């Protein structure tokens, strides 16, 4: 008795226990709180109000089987890559404010339109996150980054050697200006010598650095590797 | 984790280690854990200190024996019990989820209730270091579909959650990405610079009920009615 | 392109039955694409391969070949083109690392420690969880150390160059290497990583990589050895890693417990960089520079 | 960064009389609890009433206010100067006997403005928000076999409880029930 | 780092007839509105350079404070407060310069925040001019001068297991080792 | 030769997105990237296809 | 109650817990110290200035 | 006479008795220094006699 009865005439400094739901009433310890609702408990035994939530993205439509995770593609850039329903969705969020940046319509069929899941990413040197749903076949999602700098003032910059971006455009391809994103850049490719021009980027100096970022989709397809012998 | 391949299905826990070689075809070797599964790919989490997952009862970390360095589960979520159990009908397995808040120590749970099958209502925040528990809870519920930790290009390392606020026809109408821990203590926090226009807000915490004169009582939260803008009340009835 | 046989620079070949095509060991330089080959003209072809068909065909069966590229860029104003002739701004060969450092678009390590003899090169800007370890000491040039860096089937002895891809969170990187206890400790900037070789040194065969916490490291400045345990800054304090005696394996403990409140200024980006580690040994004491919101120089 | 009075919603949307390029914030309130152990001194029978409840608040996350630098759009500069950034203020509800009709005091840390006879010059309201740690003494007179703590809020206030202590005193076990 | 001495930036000379450099004056400057009565000191509320720490107990006036050049007076004039600010209680208006300076012996000695040594003699600090000061030693002698910085240690808080009972102190017993 | 690399693909793109193509990647959208030997495993043709990912020891 | 009153009318020389800026006042160790600066604290529990 | 100021600093282990009279629910010490001066602090003990229960506030 004596125990307990000097505890509870005590000052009750320790209670970083958290909540506990399961134990009676009687038998709650010292250090735990039967109800705990929005409180955060500090390891020292403070008991403080949590935080709020900032909404930074909102839109309205019908959404089910969602997921959202985050990701740097192989300069440093960092977006949020997310399917909704059907669709694979980028964003990028900067002072709390997330932009749309992509929209991958009808990645998926109605069978994964509700269907969550199982998200990867790996680090290469054209990184990729790989969307495994138990329906569909496996889904990767690829960045493929080039980097140049600009020798003349004007709207335009030119990329020597891009073969990778023949199908460059604004659904494909995002134009960062020293870290800064270009609104509508217009892209012209040429196949005779490899080289995409890229205009309407605005005022550019000499030596300002021009990162293009181009995200694709792919399926993954059943395929048999031999050697010729 | 820890040298080892841990293969969570849903009634047990294997473990695959190489040994002092890779793991190939000729070098496997399947350890039998425990008999407590996990519930789905997205409720496997690795902390500072151990990998933790969510099985029907609760909540699970693994750890090494001290006899002769086997694996063994350890119940985190003792105390809260309770909490637990909705996940033994398929329906509600795909809807809980598991994050990792590294800025804070903690693990985020969002969990689910009987009545909404669309994404998890309540969440649950673990601190790692003395294997606490908490409960964050918003009106109408904090409907999540995933929890994830990115990098805003100003701020930098946060936890986004993506969620709805509204419902149409017991499907979600809406899609909105929010942001934790912000710099006030409201919830669905949003700035707008004024123009002369209206400001949208959220859903109204409420329940509607038909009266029928021989019922008296009618019930206040989710528990009792089932509907998505219920809210949870002060336990004080002199408030 | 610069080419060193047996310790003395050779001159290139452009022309056909010049002068120096006469000149044994001898070279000539060539550029091959899927669409053929073409070889070399003028000092100004864009070349990416070397032979020695010279009017003496070939090489001695041990001649050392040596060929590099002098191109200084991505490096300061005051440095040379030329080979090392104890000088300053010379070029010192690096067998193999511009297959995993980008000396066209300037990636280039970031990361140094040294592991059982071997230098160890951790951090890519474009291959972010990649590190690549040199040949045991002096093993392919005697007299030189720590020079090779190559992977192919040309030497497949263990003694040779090896690397270790890491698979982990995203927007991770390797930050900081040490060696401790038997084990290489890669730290990343969300994870820490250990690599053990058992009972053997650690080579392409014998590299196995434990997963120890998902604490990782500010930058390499944050990591030291004490008389008693190895310490680490991360993004929430202080943590030093201990063995397990369930098992053996490593995880880590929180030492600045108590300070918790003081930490957390270093997961924006551009403080990354600014807190730094020392330790003195003299006083038996760990110097932590920390820094704080609104100074971002030091 | 001036809150104002909520008006009334109209079909979800809700509009405000605010000068053009005014910083609007707006988000729904959550309810915050802690709620403490049950004391029965180790009986089941005896009464113990209660005298007073120590809480021990640490407000430095609090004591910090609004400078003139702050000023958006010409607003009122002496409506947001010396203005508390993070309000502090909580309630404090105390149940006996299992009973969950307890007594209540709701504004611990005093008024969020000036009253006559109460506020104090050159320090803004409440004044026990601007000291770093505050202890406060609430008294709480009541008689029961069990008795228990909830500190709670449903505002945009924060409250960040360090410590608590009850005083009480044992009597006899003459409990009989609620009705 | 551990110098022979207990003064920041120690810097040895011989006596020339040259002067001394001093590094920066600890000290933070601030455009006064009229509208503002609160302004930080402490680095985390001010974000400058050459901010320094204050001694947490107000009732020591560690502050040389200046409006327009105008010595303002640590109780009449100004209030150091608990949380990093100091209180303007008189009038001033909008664009004076607001100075405070680190003086830990007061108004009395604004150059205290320096030590000199002239021969392994402590000198009173001379005024500095344009962060350099002359003494007038003779040629030869050895000028050792630093920054002085604040050490302090502090007890844990002493309750005796009570948040409202009264403990009168009596007496401190210090053991020091002086060898 | 002996040394040439044969990859035959299947490019039936059922069980996928309406906006996928039935052709190899080439810097597109909805094309297809080999998996050497994963039908041997998943159904290509009842729709049963893996789902969950992982990584361990440099191999998916 | 007996623990700490008789704690904190005894003589405190094991001061060797350095510097504890995460508990409560009411909860700082008495080998800790809330505030420390520019104070060395040796492993015998003496403080000293730097 | 003979020793130098201050006399105190002369004895190699000194203990002070510093009187502090003031009444409060919690007490604390700062033993600070703003000078060139040293101190080592070897221990401490405090002499507080305890009363029933009127705090009120500083306001």
């Given at each position: 008795?004596?125990?307990?009865?000097?505890?509870?005439?005590?000052?009750?400094?320790?209670?970083?226990?958290?909540?506990?739901?399961?134990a009676?009433?009687?038998?709650?310890?010292?250090?735990?709180?039967?109800?705990?609702?929005?409180?955060?408990?500090?390891?020292?035994?403070?008991?403080?109000?949590?935080?709020?939530?900032?909404?930074?993205?909102?839109?309205?439509?019908?959404?089910?089987?969602?997921?959202?995770?985050?990701?740097?593609?192989?300069?440093?850039?960092?977006?949020?890559?997310?399917?909704?329903?059907?669709?694979?969705?980028?964003?990028?969020?900067?002072?709390?404010?997330?932009?749309?940046?992509?929209?991958?319509?009808?990645?998926?069929?109605?069978?994964?339109?509700?269907?969550?899941?199982?998200?990867?990413?790996?680090?290469?040197?054209?990184?990729?996150?790989?969307?495994?749903?138990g329906?569909?076949?496996?889904?990767?999602?690829l960045?493929?980054?080039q980097?140049?700098?600009?020798?003349?003032?004007?709207?335009?910059?030119?990329?020597?050697?891009?073969?990778?971006?023949?199908?460059?455009?604004?659904?494909?391809?995002?134009?960062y200006?020293?870290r800064?994103?270009?609104?509508?850049?217009?892209?012209?490719?040429?196949?005779?010598?490899?080289?995409?021009?890229?205009?309407?980027?605005?005022?550019?100096?000499?030596?300002?650095?021009?990162?293009?970022?181009?995200?694709?989709?792919?399926?993954?397809?059943?395929?048999?590797?031999?050697?010729?012998? | 984790?820890?040298?080892?391949?841990?293969?969570?299905?849903?009634?047990?826990?294997?473990?695959?280690?190489?040994?002092?070689?890779?793991?190939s075809?000729?070098?496997?070797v399947?350890?039998?854990?425990?008999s407590?599964?996990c519930?789905?790919?997205?409720?496997?989490?690795?902390?500072?200190?151990?990998?933790?997952?969510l099985s029907?009862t609760?909540?699970?970390?693994?750890?090494?024996?001290?006899?002769?360095?086997?694996?063994?589960v350890?119940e985190?979520?003792?105390?809260?019990?309770d909490?637990?159990?909705?996940?033994?009908?398929?329906?509600?397995?795909?809807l809980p989820?598991?994050?990792?808040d590294?800025?804070?120590?903690?693990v985020?749970?969002?969990?689910?209730?009987?009545?909404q099958?669309?994404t998890?209502?309540?969440?649950?925040?673990?601190n790692?270091?003395?294997?606490?528990?908490?409960?964050?809870?918003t009106?109408?519920?904090?409907?999540?579909?995933?929890?994830?930790?990115?990098t805003?290009?100003?701020?930098?390392?946060?936890?986004?959650?993506?969620?709805?606020?509204?419902?149409?026809?017991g499907?979600?109408?809406?899609?909105?990405?929010?942001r934790?821990?912000?710099?006030l203590?409201?919830?669905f926090?949003?700035?707008?610079?004024?123009?002369?226009?209206?400001?949208?807000?959220?859903?109204?915490?409420?329940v509607?009920?038909?009266?029928?004169?021989?019922?008296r009582?009618?019930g206040?939260?989710?528990?009792?009615?089932?509907?998505?803008?219920?809210?949870?009340?002060?336990?004080?009835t002199?408030? | 392109?610069?080419?060193?046989?047996?310790?003395?620079?050779?001159?290139?070949?452009?022309?056909?039955?010049?002068?120096?095509?006469?000149?044994?060991?001898?070279?000539?330089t060539?550029?091959?694409?899927?669409?053929?080959?073409?070889?070399?003209?003028?000092?100004?072809?864009?070349?990416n391969?070397?032979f020695?068909?010279?009017?003496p065909?070939?090489?001695?069966?041990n001649?050392?070949?040596?060929?590099?590229?002098n191109?200084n860029?991505?490096?300061?104003?005051?440095?040379?083109?030329?080979?090392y002739?104890?000088?300053?701004?010379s070029?010192?060969?690096?067998?193999?690392?511009?297959?995993?450092?980008?000396y066209?678009?300037g990636?280039?390590?970031?990361?140094?420690?040294?592991?059982?003899?071997?230098?160890?090169?951790?951090?890519?800007?474009?291959?972010?969880?990649?590190?690549?370890f040199?040949?045991?000491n002096?093993?392919?040039?005697?007299?030189?150390?720590?020079?090779?860096?190559?992977?192919?089937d040309d030497?497949?002895?263990?003694?040779?160059?090896?690397?270790?891809?890491?698979?982990?969170?995203?927007?991770?990187?390797?930050?900081?290497?040490?060696?401790?206890?038997?084990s290489?400790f890669?730290?990343?900037?969300?994870?820490?990583?250990?690599?053990?070789?058992?009972?053997?040194?650690?080579?392409?065969?014998?590299?196995?990589?434990?997963?120890?916490?998902?604490?990782?490291?500010?930058?390499?400045?944050?990591i030291?050895?004490?008389?008693?345990?190895?310490?680490?800054?991360?993004?929430?304090?202080?943590?030093?890693?201990?063995?397990?005696?369930?098992?053996?394996?490593?995880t880590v403990k929180?030492?600045?417990?108590?300070?918790?409140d003081?930490?957390?200024?270093?997961?924006?980006?551009?403080?990354?960089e600014?807190?730094?580690m020392?330790?003195?040994?003299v006083?038996?004491?760990?110097?932590?520079?920390?820094?704080d919101?609104?100074?971002?120089?030091? | 960064?001036?809150?104002?009075?909520?008006?009334?919603?109209?079909?979800?949307?809700?509009?405000?009389?605010?000068?053009?390029?005014?910083?609007?914030?707006?988000?729904?309130?959550?309810?915050?609890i802690?709620?403490?152990?049950?004391?029965?001194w180790?009986?089941?029978?005896?009464?113990?009433?209660?005298?007073h409840?120590?809480?021990?608040?640490?407000?430095?996350?609090?004591?910090?206010?609004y400078?003139?630098?702050?000023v958006?759009?010409?607003?009122?500069?002496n409506?947001?100067?010396?203005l508390?950034?993070?309000?502090?203020?909580?309630?404090?509800?105390?149940?006996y006997?299992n009973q969950?009709?307890?007594?209540?005091?709701y504004?611990?840390?005093?008024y969020?403005?000036?009253?006559?006879?109460?506020?104090?010059f050159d320090?803004?309201?409440?004044y026990?928000?601007?000291?770093?740690?505050?202890?406060?003494?609430?008294?709480?007179?009541?008689?029961?076999?069990?008795?228990q703590?909830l500190?709670?809020?449903h505002?945009?206030?924060?409250?960040?409880?360090?410590?608590?202590?009850?005083?009480?005193?044992?009597?006899?076990?003459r409990?009989?029930?609620?009705? | 780092?551990?110098?022979?001495?207990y003064?920041?930036?120690?810097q040895?000379?011989?006596?020339?007839?040259?002067?001394?450099?001093?590094?920066?004056?600890?000290?933070?400057?601030?455009?006064?509105?009229?509208?503002?009565?609160?302004?930080?000191?402490?680095?985390?509320?001010t974000?400058?350079?050459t901010?320094?720490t204050?001694?947490?107990?107000?009732?020591?006036?560690?502050?040389?404070?200046?409006l327009?050049?105008?010595?303002?007076?640590?109780?009449?004039?100004?209030?150091?407060?608990?949380?990093?600010?100091?209180?303007?209680?008189?009038t001033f208006?909008?664009?004076?310069t607001?100075?405070?300076?680190?003086s830990?012996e007061?108004?009395?000695?604004?150059?205290?925040?320096?030590?000199?040594?002239?021969?392994?003699?402590?000198?009173v600090?001379?005024?500095?001019?344009?962060?350099?000061?002359?003494?007038?030693?003779?040629?030869?002698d050895?000028?050792?001068?630093?920054?002085?910085?604040?050490?302090?240690?502090?007890?844990?808080?002493?309750?005796?297991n009570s948040l409202?009972?009264?403990?009168?102190?009596?007496?401190?017993?210090?053991?020091?080792?002086?060898?």
């Amino acid at each position: 008795r004596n125990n307990e009865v000097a505890a509870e005439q005590s000052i009750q400094s320790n209670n970083f226990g958290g909540l506990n739901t399961l134990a009676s009433p009687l038998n709650v310890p010292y250090q735990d709180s039967p109800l705990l609702l929005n409180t955060t408990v500090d390891t020292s035994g403070q008991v403080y109000k949590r935080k709020g939530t900032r909404i930074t993205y909102t839109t309205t439509g019908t959404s089910t089987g969602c997921y959202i995770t985050g990701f740097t593609s192989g300069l440093a850039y960092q977006f949020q890559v997310a399917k909704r329903g059907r669709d694979i969705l980028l964003f990028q969020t900067t002072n709390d404010v997330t932009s749309l940046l992509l929209t991958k319509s009808n990645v998926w069929d109605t069978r994964a339109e509700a269907v969550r899941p199982s998200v990867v990413t790996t680090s290469e040197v054209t990184p990729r996150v790989i969307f495994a749903t138990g329906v569909n076949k496996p889904v990767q999602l690829l960045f493929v980054e080039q980097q140049t700098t600009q020798t003349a003032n004007g709207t335009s910059v030119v990329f020597s050697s891009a073969d990778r971006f023949v199908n460059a455009s604004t659904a494909n391809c995002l134009v960062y200006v020293n870290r800064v994103l270009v609104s509508a850049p217009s892209f012209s490719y040429n196949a005779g010598t490899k080289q995409l021009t890229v205009s309407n980027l605005g005022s550019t100096v000499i030596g300002d650095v021009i990162d293009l970022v181009s995200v694709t989709w792919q399926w993954w397809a059943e395929s048999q590797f031999w050697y010729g012998d | 984790w820890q040298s080892s391949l841990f293969i969570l299905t849903r009634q047990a826990v294997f473990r695959a280690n190489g040994g002092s070689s890779i793991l190939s075809s000729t070098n496997r070797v399947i350890s039998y854990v425990s008999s407590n599964g996990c519930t789905n790919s997205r409720c496997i989490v690795r902390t500072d200190f151990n990998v933790m997952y969510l099985s029907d009862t609760g909540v699970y970390n693994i750890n090494p024996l001290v006899e002769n360095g086997e694996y063994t589960v350890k119940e985190l979520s003792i105390k809260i019990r309770d909490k637990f159990g909705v996940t033994r009908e398929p329906v509600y397995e795909e809807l809980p989820w598991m994050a990792y808040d590294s800025v804070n120590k903690q693990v985020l749970l969002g969990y689910p209730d009987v009545g909404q099958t669309n994404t998890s209502r309540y969440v649950y925040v673990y601190n790692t270091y003395r294997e606490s528990w908490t409960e964050y809870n918003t009106p109408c519920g904090f409907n999540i579909w995933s929890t994830t930790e990115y990098t805003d290009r100003l701020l930098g390392t946060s936890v986004c959650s993506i969620l709805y606020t509204t419902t149409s026809s017991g499907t979600p109408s809406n899609f909105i990405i929010i942001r934790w821990n912000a710099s006030l203590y409201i919830d669905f926090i949003q700035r707008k610079t004024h123009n002369g226009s209206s400001y949208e807000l959220t859903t109204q915490p409420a329940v509607t009920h038909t009266t029928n004169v021989n019922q008296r009582r009618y019930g206040v939260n989710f528990t009792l009615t089932r509907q998505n803008t219920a809210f949870t009340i002060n336990p004080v009835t002199t408030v | 392109i610069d080419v060193v046989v047996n310790g003395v620079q050779r001159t290139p070949i452009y022309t056909p039955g010049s002068a120096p095509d006469s000149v044994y060991r001898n070279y000539y330089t060539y550029f091959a694409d899927t669409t053929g080959a073409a070889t070399g003209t003028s000092s100004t072809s864009l070349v990416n391969g070397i032979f020695f068909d010279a009017i003496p065909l070939g090489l001695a069966t041990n001649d050392t070949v040596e060929a590099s590229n002098n191109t200084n860029i991505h490096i300061g104003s005051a440095s040379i083109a030329t080979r090392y002739n104890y000088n300053d701004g010379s070029y010192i060969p690096a067998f193999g690392l511009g297959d995993f450092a980008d000396y066209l678009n300037g990636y280039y390590p970031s990361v140094v420690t040294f592991f059982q003899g071997r230098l160890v090169f951790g951090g890519f800007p474009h291959r972010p969880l990649q590190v690549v370890f040199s040949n045991v000491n002096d093993n392919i040039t005697p007299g030189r150390y720590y020079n090779s860096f190559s992977i192919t089937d040309d030497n497949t002895a263990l003694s040779s160059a090896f690397d270790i891809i890491l698979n982990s969170r995203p927007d991770d990187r390797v930050v900081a290497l040490i060696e401790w206890q038997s084990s290489l400790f890669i730290l990343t900037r969300q994870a820490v990583f250990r690599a053990n070789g058992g009972s053997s040194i650690l080579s392409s065969t014998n590299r196995v990589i434990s997963y120890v916490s998902s604490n990782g490291c500010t930058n390499s400045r944050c990591i030291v050895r004490t008389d008693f345990n190895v310490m680490y800054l991360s993004d929430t304090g202080v943590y030093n890693i201990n063995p397990l005696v369930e098992n053996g394996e490593y995880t880590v403990k929180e030492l600045s417990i108590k300070i918790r409140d003081k930490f957390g200024v270093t997961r924006e980006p551009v403080y990354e960089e600014l807190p730094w580690m020392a330790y003195d040994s003299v006083n038996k004491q760990v110097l932590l520079g920390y820094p704080d919101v609104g100074q971002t120089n030091t | 960064n001036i809150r104002q009075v909520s008006p009334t919603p109209s079909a979800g949307t809700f509009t405000l009389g605010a000068t053009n390029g005014d910083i609007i914030n707006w988000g729904v309130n959550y309810l915050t609890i802690y709620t403490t152990p049950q004391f029965l001194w180790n009986s089941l029978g005896n009464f113990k009433r209660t005298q007073h409840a120590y809480l021990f608040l640490d407000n430095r996350d609090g004591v910090g206010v609004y400078v003139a630098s702050d000023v958006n759009n010409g607003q009122d500069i002496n409506q947001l100067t010396e203005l508390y950034r993070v309000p502090i203020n909580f309630n404090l509800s105390v149940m006996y006997n299992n009973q969950l009709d307890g007594s209540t005091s709701y504004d611990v840390m005093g008024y969020d403005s000036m009253y006559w006879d109460e506020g104090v010059f050159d320090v803004s309201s409440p004044y026990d928000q601007y000291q770093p740690y505050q202890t406060l003494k609430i008294p709480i007179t009541g008689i029961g076999y069990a008795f228990q703590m909830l500190i709670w809020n449903h505002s945009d206030e924060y409250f960040k409880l360090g410590g608590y202590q009850i005083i009480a005193k044992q009597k006899g076990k003459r409990h009989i029930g609620r009705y | 780092w551990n110098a022979s001495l207990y003064i920041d930036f120690i810097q040895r000379k011989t006596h020339n007839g040259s002067s001394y450099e001093l590094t920066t004056q600890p000290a933070v400057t601030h455009t006064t509105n009229v509208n503002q009565r609160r302004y930080g000191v402490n680095f985390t509320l001010t974000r400058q350079n050459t901010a320094f720490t204050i001694n947490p107990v107000t009732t020591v006036n560690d502050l040389y404070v200046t409006l327009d050049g105008t010595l303002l007076t640590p109780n009449v004039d100004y209030i150091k407060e608990e949380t990093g600010y100091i209180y303007l209680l008189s009038t001033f208006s909008t664009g004076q310069t607001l100075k405070i300076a680190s003086s830990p012996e007061g108004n009395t000695t604004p150059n205290s925040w320096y030590t000199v040594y002239v021969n392994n003699i402590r000198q009173v600090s001379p005024t500095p001019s344009a962060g350099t000061f002359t003494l007038g030693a003779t040629n030869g002698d050895i000028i050792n001068w630093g920054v002085n910085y604040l050490t302090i240690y502090t007890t844990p808080q002493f309750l005796w297991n009570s948040l409202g009972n009264f403990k009168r102190t009596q007496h401190a017993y210090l053991f020091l080792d002086n060898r």
